[PDB]
Point group: D2
Chain length 450, copies 4
């Protein structure tokens, strides 16, 4: 079953049960690039509700719309923001580069729902263009995915990491520069580096919220105020702030805000920096936890996967593999974002959909993996104290402890001999004319090296 | 409704209507990264059928499996390749970096269907690992998406472009180097550059099929032949060739084939080169067709979108915008592919899922946009002969025609004067002591400049 | 002539006239990657002086060094910072990933100069490692290239752009979205978008100075305080602040500061955002200024290059071409910086030299092109008022001016007719039953559209 | 001292001792971007000689030039190709995007040398433009850097790797998937993966020579034959083949050859694939060789650097660090190459200099590091047989050897017990009711696992 409808290019069969109109139906059959996987990112659909709902309130204020119509659009708009009318946004990312098609998608459905509870162009899109409106929906959603989704789960990741940092603070281990044996440090200090990276990462993405706080709405087709009442920007950007719970200003220069999306390239660059930080932590942990007999085996990773009896003690760091796979995706997504970010042309940058998609995709992926990694990995890591101690005493790096109370020549003879024999520093000092067992400890205490 | 099942980690509720087992159900709830949008690329699911079906035939040959079991797995396997059991592969891309989870997904469902028509590990995964098997499914699918989807639609794109090249072969236009006015060329020659780029692009991706022709299957867990009958590689890689319609060899060095996916980085690099070629063509056309009054307006683009009566003759090059958005995505996807491509570790590269996904995503997107662009744009472009001629005679570049039959001094005086007055070369030559109207044409014929 | 010298690996011939020692000479012949073009970035050489000079003062304070030796190292160190001993740093970028070789290069020469006015390891490298020391020289130089070189020239670029913005503020022009004809805006408003982008760019790079303000010095070999007197970090990072004129703190977590260089990836990401902004401005200007007869020709670009008499009025936007070439290089350099930025391993990231080089190379290039572009292009741009006006009246976009004082039907008939005839809105309104000449102006004033 | 000279823009002081003219001097002071480090890549300067020398021969053939003039230009041109007049090419990369300035640089000096032994434009640049000529110099140099520099040193790298592969062919070691313990393989097989990667890399770059074989020369300003004698392309591209020793054809479509440099993006993509291959090999070796007591220490790396007596047996894999730093640079350089590669505009791509520079820079760097790494690392690597054997017997993976001659239950009890006790499989089997010492060997022979 269908339902004939009109636009301008004439008659067209629109599905009976869907809330969209002709324009959405015609564009849906013109840009089927990528299939359902590329279906316009949901958190962007929800932002249209917030914007259209807000568009109603602020235009009704300026007396441009009849209150009855408003109360109708508002409810319908907030039901989008709610997530009930998600199946009515079938449009893909690779559509018009200005996001015109999805904006018209929002209007058509928020219009047909308003009726049910009238005009797609004159009412819902009143005092707005497809140009100022889209880059406003980008900033809102992005801000919401970060403040509400990312940041929260990013903090948990830091706390869970800091707990273990506290938990392994007494365990002294060997440092590895150039992958080689180095002087000691606590395993807790090792993990406090991971914690600091995560912390910095939070401030980096939290800071990005600032460039996103500036909204284009009010600049219409070219950044010029035309077809808008004076102060609409300030009112709408104020109305949206009250609707989201976040503070949003209007863009100081409406041209810069439409002609380019530098605020996305920045933010992406911050997420990109975070991805580097998480790659290092995830690779370390999997190396540190590798084994059981032919690897570091310093840490013991949880076995969230079912193991074969024939291979006991074998656990693949699958939460590390999934995390590192995510991280790379972001590096690639950011790459895609910067080229598109330089491709603006005159008054408008027609690479919006592809930019905000990769940005939204990066945020979703990060949050999911950050969560998955915390719960399924870090929240259960435990130290292999016997292995760690085994490897401390076998190393020749703790030879500098003797140096002041022995002399460089004797201490090197100890190291030189122990290396050639494949014996420990204690054993070497003893077989040689150096010191005693109940004295070696008097001077070579691991925890006496900061 | 559910259905309790077993694996090793115990009991687990598996949906009643789905064909998968415990392992798939446990992993599905451990790696929900990205949601349904990241759901493992379908053409990869289909390749598992081809491989498992082939795994049956070749293992039955080596006498390792009971014929009854085989006939069962075969039908079930080919029903995956068919696309009937697609809703039973709910796994995402960011799972185990070896693709183990999706391979086990294929086995569990091809096993439960086999019954219905028995063992997930001993029968379906017989003589194969999750390590040699996955990079084999990557090459098969990729090869199939290119030979059957891409290349075909890429040729049409070239033919449609070459038709117009032939069609506008008589139309002489101005060349634009440094975006400035230059000597003439036919609009057909302009379009024959687009055609050549497309042609080169085809040979570039067609050539990539070669590195993909080499299959890992037979190398098991580390590239070593262990747990495989001798010649299984040659038989299976032969059996798969007969099953796909394409020629596939087995990889000469099974280690290089598991430890790294350089064949994906190459192919991606070829798709990446193609994307550059299509960006240039798409941008040209939109500039060439811009207007109506304040742009080049050399070409007239189809109006596939409904236009407002108040703005006649206005047509946004929406098939150009969608195409360029696609192209950038590929540049980004390739970026993501090269880092992952260098991150192999020892005997295995655990960045497989993310690599083949971006590769499959690039191919789908390209084909879709290549099609969409042909039909909705190039297949209807028409020249604005009056505009083109208007701009030919206004230019001062056709001044070199007079040079031999006049002299450098006179010809520059013509150009110098016409520029200062904002008059044409004809008008200038006449008001000055140079030549006649019925003689100017005798020497300045546009089509006398190769 | 040479000069035999010693280290440990024995005898080696060191050039007679050079100030370096054995280690520098041995490494110079082991890593000749890239030739003189890759010779370690000078501003990095100068920073070593600042650091070594400061290393002297602060270690003399802690009583670790004899005042005579100090006064000697100080003068020699400041002569490096001065730029007199530049020809004594022959080391390339692709050397040890920790920057050990260049640090030892600084020590050897600052030692042999100190003599002349003693120990390379015990005196100049006193209380410091090649690990904490290098990432400190990176931050200092980078901070100095930005505060002293970049930012300054970036502001001039903004002022020169804002002057012209003021200068063309009265000139009304047509807007170009989707490259198509749109509603009007002043050319000054167009240029105020360029100005805003530049302004944002400054705050973006100026902000990056913050992450760079944190110095590693004091963390030695692993981020652990070992082999350093307590408070050396705070004193040295304080002494360096007084030496540079810039405020520098010490890194809160010394591990994060050696294991990763996220502060470079961030800053680079900011320079990367700036490059996008400058690409758009530079491309616009060259398109806007293209012609003379077959292009926009809205602006008139300076002719800094010698033109052929036969081709008058032809000027290639060579300062635009050089600028856009620079911008891309930065996009590539940033790419190189992010991979290296994720490749840290345990306690140390051995991809330092390559990271800070690309960062320094980006800053130099930007400043040079920003300067070159200002002086040789923007500082002389002038508007082609007659062309601009010619194109305003030819467009059909100023049809919405009549709308309120005429009606949508009449106004579209004007537009519909004028389009078909290739006539202006004025001419169309007149030949049709619409309005008068001395009334058309009463309602269609360009500067009545915000 | 100087020497006044003329061009068109008037008088200018040209250094007395330099061979260039006005145009070079004026451009040298207009584009000083990056300083001497960005000085136009030498192998590009040499190619101009080959081209100009060839331009002489072929134009003299077509009777366009006086033999006396030719014999003069030829000698002067070949002295550039020789490398004697290198100090007369002071131009940087960021100049005119068409390479016009360096082409005019070649002409001015090859003209002033010709005299000494006449016209910069009419003689040396006869029958050629700055447009067809530059992308011809790019292909020639690139082809020469690969055939003569890269490929050769790349083969040595493969042979040196294959020698060691043969040398360690008897040594059985443990495999490491997911960084975990796996089934055995010879260290020679491990190194045969490195060898195969290198081999594939050679064919990949060798293949790229093909797209580069097509030369633009003959297409002049727009790809149109104008201002060229018929067959000049075929003659010149033939004359150049005889001059270089390599086979070069002329480009089939001269437009595609000027409007875009896809052949550089391809080749770069091949070098990019090679860089991934070399990163993996270099990282493995440094991990495999890490230690002495707290790392793998499977291999023993040469100590090309002077070591401190206090730290015996410590050797930093500095040839690995330099190699990996190089590899990343290439990944970045390729990135820079692809954006520039999509930025072609109409008839000409004005991003030539920056594209061929990064390409030449990548080739130089690769060759240098490939050499440095071979000689200073691989050509001296030796196995630590006692460590390898130590780690073989400690692993529980060789438990599948017993399986057929014992049963899954017994074999797992052995593995289960040995794991819990931290004892070897031999010891476990003995203390348990399983088998004997002089029988354990009868079944568990390492070299019985392919």
């Amino acid at each position: 079953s269908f339902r004939t409808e009109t636009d301008a290019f004439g008659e067209i069969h629109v599905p009976a049960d869907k809330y969209w109109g002709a324009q959405t139906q015609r564009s849906f059959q013109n840009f089927k690039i990528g299939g359902a996987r590329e279906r316009m990112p949901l958190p962007l659909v929800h932002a249209f509700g917030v914007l259209k709902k807000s568009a109603a309130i602020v235009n009704e204020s300026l007396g441009g719309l009849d209150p009855k119509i408003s109360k109708a659009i508002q409810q319908a708009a907030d039901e989008v923001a709610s997530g009930k009318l998600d199946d009515h946004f079938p449009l893909v990312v690779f559509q018009t580069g200005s996001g015109t098609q999805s904006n018209m998608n929002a209007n058509e459905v928020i219009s047909n729902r308003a009726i049910e509870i009238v005009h797609p162009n004159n009412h819902c899109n009143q005092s707005q263009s497809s140009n100022d409106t889209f880059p406003t929906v980008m900033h809102i959603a992005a801000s919401l995915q970060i403040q509400n989704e990312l940041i929260p789960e990013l903090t948990n990741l830091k706390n869970a990491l800091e707990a273990k940092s506290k938990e392994f603070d007494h365990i002294v281990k060997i440092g590895r520069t150039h992958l080689q044996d180095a002087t000691p440090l606590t395993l807790g200090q090792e993990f406090s580096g991971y914690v600091q990276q995560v912390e910095n990462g939070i401030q980096r993405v939290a800071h990005s919220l600032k460039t996103l706080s500036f909204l284009a709405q009010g600049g219409t087709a070219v950044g010029t105020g035309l077809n808008t009442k004076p102060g609409f920007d300030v009112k709408i950007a104020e109305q949206i702030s009250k609707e989201t719970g976040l503070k949003f200003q209007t863009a100081p220069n409406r041209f810069e805000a439409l002609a380019a999306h530098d605020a996305i390239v920045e933010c992406s660059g911050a997420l990109n920096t975070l991805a580097c930080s998480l790659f290092k932590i995830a690779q370390d942990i999997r190396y540190l936890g590798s084994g059981p007999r032919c690897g570091y085996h310093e840490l013991m990773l949880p076995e969230n996967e079912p193991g074969s009896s024939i291979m006991p003690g074998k656990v693949n760091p699958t939460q590390n593999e999934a995390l590192t796979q995510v991280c790379v995706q972001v590096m690639g997504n950011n790459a895609a974002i910067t080229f598109a970010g330089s491709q603006g042309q005159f008054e408008l940058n027609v690479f919006k959909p592809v930019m905000i998609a990769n940005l939204l995709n990066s945020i979703r992926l990060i949050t999911d993996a950050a969560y998955s990694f915390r719960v399924h990995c870090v929240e259960g890591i435990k130290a292999n104290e016997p292995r760690i101690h085994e490897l401390l005493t076998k190393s020749l790096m703790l030879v500098t402890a003797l140096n002041p109370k022995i002399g460089y020549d004797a201490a090197s003879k100890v190291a030189k001999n122990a290396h050639k024999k494949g014996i420990t520093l204690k054993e070497s000092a003893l077989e040689l004319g150096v010191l005693t067992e109940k004295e070696f400890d008097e001077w070579v205490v691991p925890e006496h090296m900061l």
